[PDB]
Amino acid sequence: MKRVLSGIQPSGEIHIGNYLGAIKQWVAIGEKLGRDAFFCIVDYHALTNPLAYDPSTLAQRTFEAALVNIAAGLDPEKVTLFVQSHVPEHTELSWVFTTLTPLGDLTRMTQFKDKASKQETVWSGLLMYPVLQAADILIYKADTVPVGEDQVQHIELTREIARRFNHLFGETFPEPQALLNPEAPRVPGIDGKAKMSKSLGNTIGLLEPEESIWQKIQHLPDDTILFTYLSYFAPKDLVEALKEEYRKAGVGTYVVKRILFDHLMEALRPIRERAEALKKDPDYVMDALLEGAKRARAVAQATMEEVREKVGLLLP
Amino acid sequence: MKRVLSGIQPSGEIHIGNYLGAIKQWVAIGEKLGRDAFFCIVDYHALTNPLAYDPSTLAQRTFEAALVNIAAGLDPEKVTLFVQSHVPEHTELSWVFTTLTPLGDLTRMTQFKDKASKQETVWSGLLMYPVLQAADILIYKADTVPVGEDQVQHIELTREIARRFNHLFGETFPEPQALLNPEAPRVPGIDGKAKMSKSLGNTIGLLEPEESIWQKIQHLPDDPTILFTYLSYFAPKDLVEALKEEYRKAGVGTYVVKRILFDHLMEALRPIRERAEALKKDPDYVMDALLEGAKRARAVAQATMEEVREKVGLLLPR
């Protein structure tokens, strides 16, 4: 990988599943690539649900997403963090890709079928979002994009558009490859019913109140989830020695639950402390997004100027 | 009628059909609205047929579109002429609009539907084009849009989108109204069949070589006539009425009429052609009119786009 583009949903709600999976990979990406580790908070994705999203809070949700992911490890002094709508060039590139995309490629997308099934009105944003994503990826000439097992379909589309474009107008874009995280754990929710995710109740937030995290730890179900969580936050030695004793009067649930709460909160302490530091200096976050936009915008304009020329538009 | 947005196709082939109808009206709108008569060369419309339009040829076709329409009468000293792609903000408003448009309303637009009924590739560009047009119209807050009778649908989509936007985020956009042109002649093609169309190749171009326009008049059909229809367009009533009476009495013959038609036709285009020749020698005038038309339109577009970004609730860069 030479340039990576990672999308960050416009939300301040972040749980241990995110942090343990994707976020650690993102940080690793920031360590290999530097300013070329592009992180984009996709605030324009909020609009795909016209009536359900809330215009009065989108700004705070977008800002909060920057604060928390920064607190979680994305270092503005080392990477490139910016807000999707702060670099308008990509919606222009988006129109160009729309002309190069067969309708059938969009209507068959699994995410569209499924969502345009649980809706009494199919808004076009639902159908076209993937084209906007391809534009976000290709305007930065990104060659690698970290995605989850269930979001790889838009990268295939992005590759198809790149090929169709290169073919019609000349070699311009790379064919992005999806970067998966097989090594990361599949964090189960606070109830064995599924996996952790905002949509469900299932989560433990990095910045959740301590009492709340405690209640969730106690109300955990049996088989074992308690030990899965413990293996994520405590040394292997202490963990295997606890599970051996678990079958007998040496160690009993309540006690392993405390060991978990303590180890979990210590892991989150570095994060929570930055969170409060960043909440005390809001301008730090605004300045990081500003500098990040400058950098991405310089790249996007170069790309956009190359695209305008190749598709043949009259230049002023 | 305060601000009008008129779309110009990216092409240098203007025929007397375009001239006698839409252009004559565009000229009238410019006399009345001056700088608020926005004229947009829609180069982005060419990309909707990706394998067919020639990219190595679009820049020139866009520039000729400006040249010929200015030669035909659109005056850069009075109006606001610019190229769609020169003010990119509308593609951004375009995304917003896309999210506020029910898929069904687009799939049922007559244009998309007819193309979708052929074994041709159904590009998302064909489906989404009306949303692009809506953003072009509203980014400039135009309240009037001149269109042919079979192109009213996209103005209706635009009003629907304006209403939806105004209700959800606060009054922002006017509901544009279509401006038809009933008083305009429906000009017949040289084969004397269907109306004159750039596609049917049955035309007489404003800049077509003289020797070529001649041959076409020479061959205008006549059953045992479009000949007197054209004559009507370019010669005084008195002369036309008398020639007709005489044509009915087998007094004056076809040949004489064709030359009267030709001379009168060439005299009508004369000023257009002289202008075209002057602009052709001075293309800086055209490019400068485009540059200035764009500054003016963009001043409005950025204002509109700031208004939208804020009402939609985006975290603004500041």
Residues in contact with B213: Cβ distance below 8 Å, sequence separation at least 6, in sequence order: B204, B205, B262, B265, B266
Contact A92, A136 (CB under 8 A): no
Angle, alpha carbons A69-A70-A76 (nearest 5°): 135
Contact A270, A277 (CB under 8 A): no
CA distance B244 to B60: 44
Q: How far apart are CA A214 and CA A212, in angstroms?
A: 5
* Annotated binding-site positions of B for ATP: 9-11, 17-18, 148-150, 187, 195-199
Closest CA of chain B from A9, distance in Å? 14
Residues B133 and B75 in one domain: yes
- Which A residues in the span 185-214 are in contact with B, Cβ-Cβ below 8 Å? none
Within an 8 Å CB–CB cutoff, is residue B315 touching chain A?
Answer: yes
The number of CA neighbours under 13 Å toward the Cβ of A57 is 9
| Cα B20 to Cα B276: distance, rounded to the nearest angstrom | 18
- Contact partners, residue B195, CB within 8 Å, separation at least 6: B17, B186, B187, B188, B189
Whether B275 and B287 map to the same domain: the answer is no
Whether A38 and A126 map to the same domain: the answer is: yes
DSSP bridge partners of A41: A8, A83
d(C-alpha B226, C-alpha B202), whole Å: 12
CA torsion sign for A8, A9, A11, A15 is negative
Is residue A237 exposed (0-12), middle (13-18) or buried (19+ Cβ within 10 Å)?
exposed
Tell me how far the alpha carbon of residue A273 is from its chain's centroid: 22
**B195 included as an active-site residue:** yes
Residue A140 near residue A3 (C-beta atoms within 8 A): yes
| B277 in the same domain as B179 | no
- The two structure tokens encoding residue A294: 């400058």
Q: Note down the domain range covering B299.
A: 1-188+283-318
Measured between CB atoms, does A315 come within 8 Å of chain B? yes
Chain A contact present for B24, CB below 8 A: no
**CA-based nearest residue to A39, from A74, A1, A10:** A74
Q: In angstroms, rounded to a whole number, what is the distance separating the alpha carbons of residues B63 and B86?
A: 13
Q: What is the C-alpha R_g of chain B?
A: 22
What's the distance, Cα to Cα, between the start and end of chain A in Å?
36
Of A99, A125, A128, the CB nearest to B48: A99
Minimal C-alpha gap between A49 and chain B (Å): 7
Q: C-alpha angle B138/B99/B166, rounded to 5°?
A: 45
CA–CA separation, B16 and B2 (whole Å):
29
A77 alpha carbon, distance to own chain's centre: 19
Q: Do B178 and B204 have their domain in common?
A: no
- Candidate list B32, B113, B195, B295, residue with the active-site label: B195
The method of structure determination was: X-ray
What strand order describes the sheet that includes A144-146? Answer: A80-83, A37-41, A4-8, A144-146, A177-179
Q: What is the CATH number of the domain that holds B37?
A: 3.40.50.620
Residues 6+ apart with CB under 8 A from B181: B21, B22, B25, B146, B148
Known catalytic residue at B237:
no
For the record, the structure tokens of A253 come out as: 């649930």
CA distance A65 to A71: 10
8 Å CB contact between B70 and B76: yes
DSSP string covering chain B, please?
Answer: ---EEEEE-S-S--BHHHIIIIIHHHHHHHHHHGGGEEEEE-GGGGGGSTTTS-HHHHHHHHHHHHHHHHHHT--TTTSEEEEGGGSTHHHHHHHHHHHTSBHHHHHTSHHHHHHTTSSS--BHHHHHHHHHHHHHHHHTT--EEE--GGG-HHHHHHHHHHHHHHHHHSS-----EEE--TTS--PBPTTSSSB--TTTT---BSSS-HHHHHHHHHT------HHHHHHHHHS-HHHHHHHHHHHHTT-S-HHHHHHHHHHHHHHHHHHHHHHHHHHHH-HHHHHHHHHHHHHHHHHHHHHHHHHHHHHTT-----
- Give the residue numbers of A marked as catalytic: 115, 195, 198
Q: How many angstroms separate the Cα of A37 from the Cα of each of A25, A148, A223?
A: 11, 18, 41
Token reading at B272: 């257009």
Q: Which residues of B touch A116 (CB under 8 A)?
A: 103
Instruction: Give the up-direction half-sphere exposure of residue A61: CA atoms within 13 A in the CB hemisphere.
Output: 19
Q: Helices A153-169 and A124-139, interaxial angle, to 10°?
A: 60
Please name every residue paired with A5 in a beta bridge, in sequence order, or none if there are none. Answer: A38
CA distances (Å), origin B158, targets A225, A268, B20, B197, B307: 54, 50, 28, 27, 18
- Going by C-alpha positions, the residue among B182, B144, B180, B176 that lies closest to residue B160 is B176
**Residue B126: closest CA among A104, A170, A129:** A104
Q: Are A102 and B122 in contact (CB under 8 A)?
A: yes
Q: Which among A57, A59, A100 is the nearest to B50, CB-wise?
A: A100
Catalytic residue among B24, B115, B244, B311: B115
Residues of B in contact with A312 (CB under 8 A): 54-59
Task: Answer for the pair A310, B50: CB distance below 8 angstroms, yes or no.
Answer: no
CA distance A235 to A22: 21
Q: For residues B140 and B300, give the distance between their C-alpha atoms in angstroms, rounded to a whole number.
A: 6
* Contact by Cβ (8 Å): A233, A263: yes
Go through A85-116 and write b for each residue having 16 or more CB atoms within 10 A of its CB, e for each that does not: bbbbbbbbbbbbbbbbbebebbeebeebeebb
Q: Yes or no: say if B84 and B43 are a contact pair by the CB < 8 Å rule.
A: yes
Q: Are residues B8 and B113 in the same domain?
A: yes
Please state, in angstroms and as integers, the Cα–Cα distance from residue A17 to each residue in A195, A275, B171, following that order: 9, 18, 42
- The alpha-carbon gap from B149 to the nearest alpha carbon of chain A, in Å, equals 26
Calpha distance B206→B22 (Å, rounded): 14
Which residues of chain B lie closer than 8 angstroms to A130, CB-CB?
none
**Residue written as token pair 């079928």:** A113
- Locate tokens 């064919």: which residue? A175
Tell me, yes or no, whether B86 and B162 share the same domain: yes
Any A CB within 8 A of B297 CB? no
A314:B57 CB<8 A: no
Under 8 Å between Cβ of B133 and B158? yes
| Closest C-alpha to B315, from A271, A285, A139 | A285
Question: Residue A312, Cα to own-chain centre: how many angstroms?
Answer: 35
Distances (CA, A) of A230 to A258, B153, B181: 10, 62, 76
Catalytic residue status for B118? no
Chain A (161-180) residues lying within 8 Å, Cβ to Cβ, of chain B: 168-169
B8 strand-pairing partners: B41
* Closest Cβ–Cβ partner in A125, A169, A290 for B98: A125
Q: Rounded to 5 degrees, what are φ and ψ at A270?
A: -60, -40
Signed CA dihedral, A286, A292, A298, A301: sign only = negative
A62: phi then psi, degrees, rounded to nearest 5: -70, -45
- Written as six digits, the tokens of A104 are 């059938």
Neighbouring C-alpha atoms within 13 Å toward the C-beta of B294: 21
- Among B104, B121, B318, select the one facing A122 at the smallest CB separation: B104
The span from the CA of B192 to the CA of B187, in Å, is: 10
A83: chain B residues, CB-CB within 8 Å: 315, 317
For residues A255 and A310, membership in a common domain is answered with no
Query: What radius of gyration do chain A's Cα atoms show?
Result: 22
Residue B232 shares a structural domain with residue B311: no
- Taking the C-alpha atoms of residue A274 and residue A239, their distance in angstroms, rounded to an integer, is 28
Whether A83 sits inside 8 A of B58 (CB atoms) is no
Nearest to A103 by CA among B23, B67, B128: B128
Alpha carbon distance A56, B186 (integer Å): 52
Q: Count contacts between A and B (CB, < 8 Å).
A: 153
Asked whether the CA dihedral B110, A94, B136, B87 is positive or negative, the reply is negative
Contact B154/B134 with Cβ under 8 angstroms?
yes
Maximum Cα interatomic distance, chain A, rounded to a whole number of Å = 82
Residues A114 and A215 in one domain: no
Task: Report the sign of the C-alpha dihedral through residues B127, B129, B132, B134, in that order.
Answer: negative
Report whether A155 contacts A174 (CB < 8 A). Answer: no
CA dist A75 and A33 (Å) reads 12
- Distance from the Cα of residue B127 to its chain's centroid: 21
Cα-Cα-Cα-Cα dihedral sign, residues A132, A136, A138, A144: negative
Report whether A264 contacts A252 (CB < 8 A): no
Whether A121 contacts chain B with CB within 8 A: yes
Interface of B with A in 262-291 (CB under 8 A): 287, 290-291
Residues B46, A99: Cα–Cα separation, whole Å: 10
Q: Scanning every residue of chain B, which has its alpha carbon at the shortest distance from the alpha carbon of A123? A: B102
Q: Is there a contact between A126 and B106 if contact means CB atoms under 8 Å apart?
A: no
The Cα–Cα gap between A131 and A134 comes to 5
Clarify whether residues A64 and A98 are in a common domain: yes
Chain centre to alpha carbon of residue B8: 4
Placement of tokens 């469900």 in the chain: A200
Distance in Å, alpha carbon of A294 to nearest chain B alpha carbon: 11
Question: How far, rounded to the nearest angstrom, does the alpha carbon of residue B196 sit from its chain's CA centroid?
Answer: 15
| CATH code of the domain in which A226 resides | 1.10.240.10
Residues ending a continuous segment of chain B before a break (C–N > 2.5 Å): 224
Report the amino acid identity of residue B129: Y
DSSP labels for chain A? --SEEEEE-S-S--BHHHIIIIIHHHHHHHHHSSTTEEEEE-GGGGGGSTTTS-TTTHHHHHHHHHHHHHHTT--TTTSEEEEGGG-THHHHHHHHHHHTSBHHHHHT-HHHHHHTTS-SS-BHHHHHHHHHHHHHHHHTT-SEEE--GGG-HHHHHHHHHHHHHHHHH-S-----EEE--TTS---B-SSTTSB--TTSS---BTT--HHHHHHHHHT-----HHHHHHHHHS-HHHHHHHHHHTTTTT--THHHHHHHHHHHHHHHHHHHHHHHHHHH-HHHHHHHHHHHHHHHHHHHHHHHHHHHHHTTPPP-
Shortest CB distance from B55 goes to which of A95, A311, A315? Answer: A311
**Cα–Cα dist A89/A92, whole Å:** 5
- Declared resolution, Å: 2.5
Number of domains in chain B: 2
The answer to whether the annotation marks A240 as part of a ligand binding site is: no
Distance from CA of A234 to the nearest CA of B (A): 39
Q: Which residues, in sequence order, are bridge partners of residue B82?
A: B40
| B202, B249: one domain | yes
